[PDB]
RNA sequence: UUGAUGUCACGGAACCUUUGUUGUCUUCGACAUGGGUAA
C-alpha cells in the first residue's frame, strides 16, 4: 500500500532549482539539463504564461537512499544476521540511452559474488533496489498546491564560478535557481510499498532517511512521517519645468540614502542662513512632498519607508537614463571587516554590486563561498594544485580525498539593516583628474556581525587530520580571509569561541543513538550538542606557518585629515558641502559614526608611489597598456589576468575627535570682493602639531613577496617615499591638508625597514618713490598687464621624476609688521555676550593662520609679476549709468504685440528687435531691489531700436557684457595653458605646489590688553569702521567701447590703524558709534613670528626662481594680508631659511648655495618672452613699497559732500572736474601713489 | 507531470582590475532719485 510519508524536507539552506526547458530539447545533448540532473525543477501547468508550481523527481530521492544504504551498509556491519547484502548488481543494456550513469565508485566491504539473476528474495540490497516500479514513486511539491506567476518571481537566480588556484581569475560560470525556506518550509510526497519487504528493509529506508545530509543539493533535515510611477512623474516634471537637469543623478542618489528611517526627512539642511530655499530640497516643493508623504499612515512600517524609497530611486535613475568517525565541530564567526558576495541582479540598476540579501533583508553565507575558501586554504597547505578537470573520473589525490566527507551549513545574521554604500574612482596619470565615465560605486555590508557555523567530517581515519587541524588553528588565529574583494580588503572572519567534540567512531551503540535521533543536525540538536561540547580545539599533529604575514602601521599626522564624500553631504544636519568620510559598525542594532580612511585610497595612494620610482626599459612604467605582461608593478600588485599579493585594511584614529568647520570664499582680481558663485565649505577633522592626529592600521603581505629581493627592496623604497612627505594622504592637498610627518614599521621582522631611514642674504631693493607731507593718498591703485602672454608650451605631466627637475621642500619665516586680523567666522557672539563680534583663529587653543589665504596672497603675486590669465573672474555683469539732463528719446506705446511700437505726435511704425527685451528685464532687477532703498520711450535709427525704458530719464543699459572689455588673451583659460596655471593647476590639470598651515615660535602679543590682565592668551576688542562693497561702475565711466579693463587691484601700505585704535574715525575724526553694521574683532601687536612650509614637484629651473622670488620678493618689500586691508591691516614678509632637494630615494641633498643661479637665471626666461617691457615689472614694486621712517601716508577714503569734514575734503560730488573727468578715470588710476587732492 | 537494475553535482568562491581626486585669500566705498526746465 501507499505508506504515504510527508517528509517535509525543513531546509536549513536555500534549496536549489532549475530553469524549465521545452520537451524538444529534453534529452542527453542538452548541456544545461544534464548539468542539472540534481536540482528541483519548475513545472508549469500552461504554457502561454509562466504560472505552475515546483515539482520534484522521485528519481533523485531513489539515488539519494541507495547512496545511504550503501554507506550504512559499509559501515555498520557488513552484513545483517538474518540476511546477507552484496556490493551491488550494476550493469547497463545501453549506454546511450542512460542520460547519467554512476561514474564513481561503489564500496567493498563483501567480496561476495553477484547474486544469481533468477532470484526472488536474495538479498537486502537487491530487493529493495528492484530487479525481482512498485516500491518508490514520490513527488515532492509544495504545501496545499499554491501557484505564482514564476520561477522569477518566487525566487531569484545565481552565478557560480569555477576559479582556478593558480592564477585567480574565473574561467567558466553557471547560473541556477535558489528558493530560501524562511516562507517555503515544508514539501509533502509519499513513498509506496508492496507489503511484502521485510522488517529490516524499512528498518533500513527510514534510517537511512535520517542518515542523509544533502537533498535536492542543500543540507537539511529529512523529517519523515503602485502610488510610486506617480510620485516619480512628480519630481521629473518639477525638475523639467525648473530645468537643471544635471543633477537628476545627485537627487537619486540623495533620495536613496534615505531609506535607513523616516526620521531623516524631517532633520534635512537647510540654507546658510536657516532658511527653506536649499538648492536641492527646495527646487521647486520636494520637501513639502517628503514630509506629508513620510507621515501617511500607511507608509509607518520601516520595511515599507526603505522599499519605497528604493523603488523611487530606481524609477528616477531609469527616467533619467571499517572504522568511520564523525565530527560536530562548531563556532562563531566574528566580523573583523566589511564583508561582500557576488548577487548582482538586474532591477536595481543604479548601484551595479549587490550584496547577496536574504528575501526578509537579512545577510546571508553562502555554502559556496566557505566550500570554495576551504579549497584555497587545503590546496595551499598541501602544495598540489589539483588539476583536475569537470567529468571523467574522480582523483584519489589527497585534498579531495580529505573532501568527499566534508559538509559546512549555512548562516544567517541578525543586524537588518541596509547596507551602505562606498563609491570608487580612477586617476589619470597625466592631469591628476579623475576619468571621464570612471565614477562607480558597490554596495558593502556592515562589520561586527556574528555568524553560527557548524562542520561535519565523515571520516574514516583516528581523529581529524592534522591538515584539517591546522586549517582550522589559521582560522582561529585569524587568517580567515572568506568573503570577496580580499586584495581590496574586505573580508576577515576570526573564530571565536571555538568548541568542539570527537563525537564517536563506528560503533553500535552512540552511533545507533546518534542515528535514532536525527543527528541532532536542527535547532533543538545543535542546544543539546552544544550543552555538552568541551571547549578547547585539538593541537597540530605537523603545524606549518601560514603564508600571510601581519604588518603594523602607524602614521602620524600634523595637519587636518579630509576624505570626501559627496552623496553624505546632502542628508547631514549641517548644510556643508564636503564631509569627512564615516564608516558604520554593528554595536548592537546601532550605527555610531566612526571616523576612518579609505583602504582604496591607501592602495591607490601606495600603487602610484611604486609606480613613479621604477622604470622598466625607459618608459615610465604608468603610460603601458600592460593587459598581459611580466612588470614588477603587475607581478606585486595583481592585473586583470593575475591575482595581487598584498591586501590593505582600512585605517581608523586613536583618538575621538570632532568635526571643525571652515569655509572659503573666492576673489575676483580685477573688483577686489567677493566672486559669488558658491561659498563652498568643509568639514575637515582637527589636527595640531600639539594633539597630532595618530593613524593606525595593518596590512598584510604574503610571505614569497617579503622573502624575495627585489620584491622588498621596491617596498622600501615606496615606503621611504611615502616617509620622505612627497605623497599625502587625504584630499585637499594643495591648500594643506593631509600632511605626514612619519611612518613606522613593525611586524616585518627587520627585512623592510632596513632599507628605510649658510642661507644666502636677500638682495636690496631699487625703487623709489616720493610720499608728501600734507597730500591725501587713494588707497588702491591699478597696475595695467601686457597685450599679450606666452600660453605656447605644453604643461609637463605627473608619470615620473624626469631628468633636469627638481623636488623637495623649502622652509621659511613670517613676521608681522602691522596688526593682523584673522577672523573665525564661527561664532559671532564671542566678545559680546545686530552686533557681529568675532576673535582670532584658533584650532586646539593654539592661534595659527590657514593655508589657503597664504596660497592666494602669493598666487595673486606670482600672476601679476609674470602675466597670465586672471584666473577667477566673473564676465557676467551687466552696468548701467544713471544718465544726466545733457536726451532725445521719442514717446512711444508697447501694446501691439506682432505689430510692435507706434509713434506718439503730442506731448507709420517702428519694429522692436529680441535683443530689447533683455535689456529691459534686467533694468527691472536693482530698480527695484535698490541697496540704498503702456507708454514708453524709446529709440531709432532707421527701423531698428537702440533702448526701451519706462521713464522719461533712467539709467542707460549696456549692450556688451562685461567680459568683452579686456582682450581675449586675458580671459580665463578654462582648459596651452598659461605659466600661472602650469604651476597652480586648474581644474581639469593639477598643481604642482602645496602650502602649509602656519604656527607660532614666541608667545603671543596683543595690540590692546584684555579685560582682566589675568592671562596673556586672549586679546581685546577693537571698534572697526563700515565695511562697504565695492562696485566696478567707478573704474568704468560710461558705455563707450573705448573704456577697457585697466588690470589687477592692489592696496597701497600707509599706517592707519593708530586712528581706529583709539574712538577717531580714518577720514573725518568722529567716534565711530554703536550700529548693527560695525565690527569688533580681536588683533596681534606686529611683532610676532611664524613658520611654515611649501612643497614642490617638477619644477624647471627657471620657475623654481620665479617662485622663490615672488615668495620672498626682497628686503624692504612685504605683501599684504589680513581683514580690512584698505585701512592698512596686516603687513608680512617671508624669510627664506632652508631649501632642500632630492636626488634619490636613499639620498638627500641640502641645496642651499644653488639659489643664487635659480634666481639670476629666472630673469633670462624673462627676457626670451618679454624683451622691453618693463614698467609693468616696476610699477609693481612701486605699489607693495612698504612706508620707511618718517613717511607715513595719509590714506582716506573721500565722502560725497565736501561740506561734510569740514577740515577741508573734497567730497565726490565736485570731484568729477578738475582733478577727474569722464575720459581720465583709467590713466589715473594707472600711475600708482597719484594725489587725488 | 518521476519513469527504474547506476546522478561522487557534498564536480565549481561573480572571482579578477581603478586614490570622489581636482581649481577658488570670509574679501569689501560711492551715490540713490524722476522729472525739473518746459506752452
Ligand atoms: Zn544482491
Ligand atoms: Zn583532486
Ligand atoms: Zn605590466
Ligand atoms: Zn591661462
Redesign the pocket.
Known sequence: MTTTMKISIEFLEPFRMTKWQESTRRNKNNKEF??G??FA?W?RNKKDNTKGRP?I????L???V??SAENLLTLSDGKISEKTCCPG?????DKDRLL?????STLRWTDKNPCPDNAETYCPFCEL???S?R?????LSLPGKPDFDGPKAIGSQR?????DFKS???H???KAYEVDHTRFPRFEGEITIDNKVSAEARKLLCDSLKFT??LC?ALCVIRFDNLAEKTAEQIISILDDNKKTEYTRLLADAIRSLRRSSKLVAGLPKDHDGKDDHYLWDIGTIRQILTTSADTKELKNAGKWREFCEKLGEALYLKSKSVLKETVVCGELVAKTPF???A?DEDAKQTALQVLLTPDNKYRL?R??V???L??DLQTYFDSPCNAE??GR?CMCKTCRI??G??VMDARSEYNAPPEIR?????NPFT???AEG???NMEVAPEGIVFPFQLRYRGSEDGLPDALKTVLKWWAEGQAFMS????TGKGRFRMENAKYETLDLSDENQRNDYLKNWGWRDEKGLEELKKRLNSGLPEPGNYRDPKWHEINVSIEMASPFI?????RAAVDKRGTAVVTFVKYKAEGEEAKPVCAY?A??F???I??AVARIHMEDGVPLTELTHSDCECLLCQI????????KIRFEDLVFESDPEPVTF?????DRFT???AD?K??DDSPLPGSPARPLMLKGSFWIRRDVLEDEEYCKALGKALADVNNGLYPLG????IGYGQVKSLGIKGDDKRISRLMNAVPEKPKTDAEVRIEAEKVYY??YFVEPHKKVEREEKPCGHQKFHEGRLTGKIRCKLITKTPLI??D?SNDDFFRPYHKSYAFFRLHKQIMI?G??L???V??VYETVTNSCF??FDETKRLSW?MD?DQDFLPGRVTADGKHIQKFSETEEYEIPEKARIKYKELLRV?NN?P??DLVYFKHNEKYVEDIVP?????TVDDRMIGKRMSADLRPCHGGLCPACRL????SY??RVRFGFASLENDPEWLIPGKNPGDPFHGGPVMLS??????P??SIPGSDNKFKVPGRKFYVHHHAWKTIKDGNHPTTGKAIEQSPNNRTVEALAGGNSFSFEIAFENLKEWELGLLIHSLQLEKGLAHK??????MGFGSVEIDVESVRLRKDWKQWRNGNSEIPNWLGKGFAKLKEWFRDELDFIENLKKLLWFPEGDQAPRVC?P??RKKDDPNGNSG?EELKDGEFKKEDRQKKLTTPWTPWA
Open positions: 544534464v548539468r540532473q540534481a525543477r513545472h515539482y523527481t522521485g528519481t533523485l531513489r539515488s539519494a541507495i547512496r548488481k550494476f550493469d547497463t543494456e547519467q550513469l554512476r561514474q564513481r533496489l528492484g530487479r516500479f516500491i518508490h514513486f514520490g513527488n552565478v557560480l564560478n569555477r576559479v585567480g581569475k574565473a567558466d560560470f553557471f545530509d544533502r543539493g561582500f558576495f557576488g548582482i553562502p559556496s563561498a566550500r570554495g575558501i579549497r584555497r569537470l567529468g574522480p573532501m568527499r566534508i559538509t563609491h570608487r574612482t580612477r586617476i591628476g583628474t579623475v570612471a565614477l562607480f570577496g574583494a580580499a586584495s576624505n570626501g564624500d559627496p552623496i579609505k582604496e585610497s592602495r591607490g595612494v600603487r602610484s600588485f595583481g592585473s586583470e589576468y593575475e591575482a595581487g569655509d572659503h570664499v573666492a576673489i577686489g570682493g567677493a558663485k561659498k563652498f584630499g585637499k592637498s594643495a588707497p588702491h584673522v577672523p567666522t590657514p589657503s589665504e596660497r592666494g596672497m598666487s595673486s584666473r577667477i544713471r539732463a530698480y535698490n540704498q532703498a521713464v522719461r530719464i533712467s539709467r597652480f593647476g586648474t581644474g593639477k598643481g563700515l565695511l562697504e562693497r565695492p562696485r561702475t567707478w594680508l589680513g581683514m580690512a586691508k584698505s577714503y565722502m560725497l565726490y
